[PDB]
Amino acid sequence: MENFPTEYFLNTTVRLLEYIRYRDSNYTREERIENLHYAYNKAAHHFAQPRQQQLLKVDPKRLQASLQTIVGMVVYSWAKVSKECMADLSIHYTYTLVLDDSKDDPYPTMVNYFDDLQAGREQAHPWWALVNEHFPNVLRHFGPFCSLNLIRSTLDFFEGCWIEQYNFGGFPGSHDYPQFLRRMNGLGHCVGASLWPKEQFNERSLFLEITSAIAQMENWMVWVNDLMSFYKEFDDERDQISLVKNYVVSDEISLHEALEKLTQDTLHSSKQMVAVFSDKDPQVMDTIECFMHGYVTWHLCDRRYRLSEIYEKVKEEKTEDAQKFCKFYEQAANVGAVSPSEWAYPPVAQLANV
Amino acid sequence: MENFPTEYFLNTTVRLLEYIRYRDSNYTREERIENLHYAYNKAAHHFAQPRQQQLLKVDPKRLQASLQTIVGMVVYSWAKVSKECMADLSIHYTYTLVLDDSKDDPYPTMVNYFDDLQAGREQAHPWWALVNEHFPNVLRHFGPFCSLNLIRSTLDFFEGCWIEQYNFGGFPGSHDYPQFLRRMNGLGHCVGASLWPKEQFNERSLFLEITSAIAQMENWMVWVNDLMSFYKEFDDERDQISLVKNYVVSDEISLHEALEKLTQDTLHSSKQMVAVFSDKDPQVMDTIECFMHGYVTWHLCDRRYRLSEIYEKVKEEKTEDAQKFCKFYEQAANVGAVSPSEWAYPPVAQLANV
Numbered sequence: 001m002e003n004f005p006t007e008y009f010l011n012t013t014v015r016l017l018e019y020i021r022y023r024d025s026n027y028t029r030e031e032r033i034e035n036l037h038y039a040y041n042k043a044a045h046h047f048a049q050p051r052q053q054q055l056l057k058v059d060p061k062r063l064q065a066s067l068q069t070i071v072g073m074v075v076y077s078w079a080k081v082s083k084e085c086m087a088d089l090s091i092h093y094t095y096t097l098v099l100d101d102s103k104d105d106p107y108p109t110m111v112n113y114f115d116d117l118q119a120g121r122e123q124a125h126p127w128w129a130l131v132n133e134h135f136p137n138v139l140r141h142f143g144p145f146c147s148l149n150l151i152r153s154t155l156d157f158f159e160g161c162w163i164e165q166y167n168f169g170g171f172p173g174s175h176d177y178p179q180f181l182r183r184m185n186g187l188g189h190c191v192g193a194s195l196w197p198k199e200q201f202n203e204r205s206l207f208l209e210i211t212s213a214i215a216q217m218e219n220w221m222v223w224v225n226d227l228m229s230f231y232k233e234f235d236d237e238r239d240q241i242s243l244v245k246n247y248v249v250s251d252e253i254s255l256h257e258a259l260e261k262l263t264q265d266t267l268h269s270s271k272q273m274v275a276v277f278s279d280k281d282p283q284v285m286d287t288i289e290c291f292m293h294g295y296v297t298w299h300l301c302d303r304r305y306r307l308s309e310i311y312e313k314v315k316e317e318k319t320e321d322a323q324k325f326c327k328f329y330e331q332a333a334n335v336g337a338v339s340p341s342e343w344a345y346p347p348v349a350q351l352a353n354v
Numbered sequence: 355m356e357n358f359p360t361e362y363f364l365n366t367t368v369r370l371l372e373y374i375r376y377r378d379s380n381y382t383r384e385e386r387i388e389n390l391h392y393a394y395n396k397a398a399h400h401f402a403q404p405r406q407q408q409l410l411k412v413d414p415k416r417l418q419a420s421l422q423t424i425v426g427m428v429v430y431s432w433a434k435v436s437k438e439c440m441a442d443l444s445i446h447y448t449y450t451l452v453l454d455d456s457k458d459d460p461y462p463t464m465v466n467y468f469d470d471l472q473a474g475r476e477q478a479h480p481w482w483a484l485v486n487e488h489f490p491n492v493l494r495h496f497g498p499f500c501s502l503n504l505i506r507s508t509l510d511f512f513e514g515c516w517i518e519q520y521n522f523g524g525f526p527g528s529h530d531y532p533q534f535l536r537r538m539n540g541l542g543h544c545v546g547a548s549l550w551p552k553e554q555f556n557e558r559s560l561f562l563e564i565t566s567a568i569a570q571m572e573n574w575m576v577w578v579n580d581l582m583s584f585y586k587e588f589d590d591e592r593d594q595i596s597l598v599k600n601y602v603v604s605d606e607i608s609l610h611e612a613l614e615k616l617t618q619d620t621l622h623s624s625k626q627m628v629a630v631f632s633d634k635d636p637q638v639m640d641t642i643e644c645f646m647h648g649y650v651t652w653h654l655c656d657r658r659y660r661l662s663e664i665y666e667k668v669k670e671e672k673t674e675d676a677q678k679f680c681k682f683y684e685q686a687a688n689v690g691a692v693s694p695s696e697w698a699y700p701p702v703a704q705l706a707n708v
C-alpha cells in the first residue's frame with residue numbers, strides 16, 4: 001500500500017479500454033471546440049446572472065474550474081445530443097458538482113421540504129431554489145419517463161451529499177453501505193436517462209432499451225469514475241470516504257482487495273454492456289458506445305485525474321500493458337487535449353462584474 | 355409457472371427462519387388486537403371518504419383485502435411506534451399496494467409532472483393526487499432526513515410500477531437489471547426510515563445508525579419478502595416479473611440457482627444485521643429486532659401470501675424440511691393468527707355508502 005499499484009492499474013485500464021473497444025470516432029477536434037465553446041458560453045452567462053451569483057455560495061475560482069470540467073464531461077460523452085442539450089445539461093451537472101462545497105447542514109432548510117413543495121413555494125435551501133428553477137430547461141429535452149429519472153437521481157444526490165457531511169464510511173460489518181452510498185451520490189439514473197433526448201429517441205418505442213441502459217450504465221458509469229479517480233485519490237488524506245475506502249472500512253479488507261473488487265465489477269460491467277447492446281438498435285448502441293469512450297477520454301484528458309503522470313512514467317517502458325496504455329492515451333490526447341483558451345472564455349467572473 | 359419447486363421452497367425457507375431464529379413476542383394477544391383495530395379503523399374511515407372513493411380506482415373487495423394485509427404488516431412490524439403512526443403508515447402503504455397490483459399507464463399523466471409540482475398544482479395522475487395530499491399525515495411523525503427518505507422511496511416505487519407494466523424481466527446478459535428493478539419497487543428507504551419516529555428517536559443523535567439501518571434493512575427486507583412470497587407470485591401473471599424470475603431470464607441460470615442466490619443474499623444480510631447492531635444503541639436494536647420478527651410473523655400469517663396452502667400439503671410429508679416448516683408456520687399462527695372479525699370492521703364499503 002506504500003507504492004501505487006502501477007502495473008495492476010495499467011493492466012485493468014487497458015482491459016477496460018479493450019472490453020469497450022476504445023477507438024477513433026467521427027467526433028473531430030473542430031466539432032469538439034465548437035461544442036465546448038457553445039456549452040461553456042451559455043452556462044457561463046447563466047452562472048454570471050446576479051440571482052445565481054448570490055444564492056450560489058462558491059468560490060469564483062472553483063466555480064470556474066468546476067464549470068470547465070463539467071462542460072468537458074458533457075461535451076465529450078453526450079456526443080450525440082444537440083448543442084442546446086449539452087449546454088443545459090452542463091448547467092445542471094455543474095450545480096451538482098458545486099453542492100459538494102457546502103458544509104451547511106441541510107437539516108434547517110429541509111424541515112419544510114414537502115409542505116413547501118406541495119404548496120408551490122420556493123425551497124428554503126438556496127441550491128434547491130436555483131436547481132428547481134432551472135430544471136425545466138433540462139427536462140424540456142426529454143419525455144416523461146426519462147424526466148422522472150433525472151428528477152429522482154437529483155433528489156438522491158442531494159441526500160448523498162447530506163450523508164457525506166458526516167464523513168462516515170460505514171460501520172465495520174455493514175457490507176451493504178458502500179454501494180448504498182455510491183448510488184445515492186452517483187447520479188446514475190440522471191446520467192443514464194439524459195442520454196436519450198426525445199428529439200432523437202422515442203421514449204415509448206425504446207422503453208426497454210432505455211430502462212436497461214439506465215440500469216447497466218448506472219454501475220458502469222460510477223465504477224469507471226471510481227477507478228480512474230483511484231490514482232489521484234491514492235494519497236489524498238483529505239478525500240476520506242470513496243467507494244474503495246468504504247469497502248476497506250465496511251468490509252474489513254485491504255485497500256488492495258477493495259481495488260480488486262472494484263476492477264472486477266468494472267470489467268464485468270463492461271463485458272455485459274457490450275454483450276447486451278451490440279445487436280440492439282444501432283442508434284442506441286451508438287449513444288452507449290460514444291458515452292463510454294468519451295467518458296474515458298474525459299478522465300484521460302482532464303488535469304483533475306493527473307493520469308498524464310502515469311503516461312510520463314511508462315512512456316518508454318517496453319512492457320505489453322505500458323505500451324497499450326500509452327497508445328490509448330495518445331489517441332485520447334489526439335482528440336481530447338484542448339487548451340481552455342480555445343473555448344472557455346470569457347471567465348464567469350468577468351461576465352458577473354459586467 | 356410449470357411446476358412449483360415445493361421441495362426446494364421448504365429447504366430455503368427453513369434455512370432463513372432457522373438462521374434468524376424466527377420468534378415473535380412483539381405483542382400480547384391483546385395489544386395486537388388493539389393496534390390492529392386502531393389502525394384499521396382510522397384507515398377505513400379515510401378510504402371511505404367520497405374523494406378517496408372517487409379518485410382511487412380499485413375493486414372494493416380488493417381495497418378491503420389490501421387494507422387488511424397492510425394494517426397487519428404495519429402493526430406486526432412497526433411494534434414500537436405510536437398507534438397514530440401505525441394508522442398513518444397503514445394508509446400510505448395501502449396506497450402503494452393498491453398500485454403494486456394495478457395495471458395502469460402513467461405516461462399521459464406524467465407529461466407535466468415537474469411543472470405542476472413546481473407550480474403547486476394538483477398532479478394529473480389521481481394516485482399522486484391522493485398520496486401527496488395525504489403524505490403530510492405521515493411525514494409529521496418524522497424529522498427532515500427520514501422524511502426525505504420516505505418521499506424518495508415513494509417516487510422510486512411509482513417508477514417501478516411504471517416499468518413493471520411492460521412485463522419485462524430484462525435482456526439476457528443484463529445482470530444489473532434484476533436488483534435495479536427490485537430496489538425501484540421495494541420501498542426499502544421508505545420502510546427503513548419510517549422505523550424512526552421523532553417522538554422516540556433523535557434523527558441527529560442517531561444519524562449514523564439510522565442511515566446504516568436504512569442501507570441494510572433495504573435489502574434484508576426485500577429479499578425476505580422475495581423468499582417468503584415466492585409461492586403466491588409463482589403463477590400470478592402480474593407478478594411473473596419478479597426478482598427470482600428476472601434472475602433466471604437476465605442471468606441465464608436455472609430457477610433453482612436463482613433461488614440459491616436469493617437465500618445466500620438473505621442469510622448473509624441477516625448475519626450482518628446482527629453483527630452490526632447487536633452492540634449499538636439498545637433502543638435501535640429493539641426496533642430492528644422487532645421489525646425482523648414481526649415481518650416474518652406477518653408473512654407466515656397474512657392471506658396475501660397463501661402460505662397456508664403450502665402447509666396443507668406438507669403437514670403429512672415426513673421430509674425433515676416440511677417438518678421444520680410446519681413447526682415454524684404453527685408458531686407464527688399461534689401469536690399472529692387473528693380472526694379479522696376481531697378488528698377489521700366495519701367494512702370500508704359499508705362506511706362509504708353511509
Ligand SMILES: [Mg+2]
Nearest residue numbers: 454514539540
Ligand atoms: Mg412490486
Ligand SMILES: [Mg+2]
Nearest residue numbers: 454455592593
Ligand atoms: Mg407485488
Ligand SMILES: [Mg+2]
Nearest residue numbers: 579580583587
Ligand atoms: Mg414479493
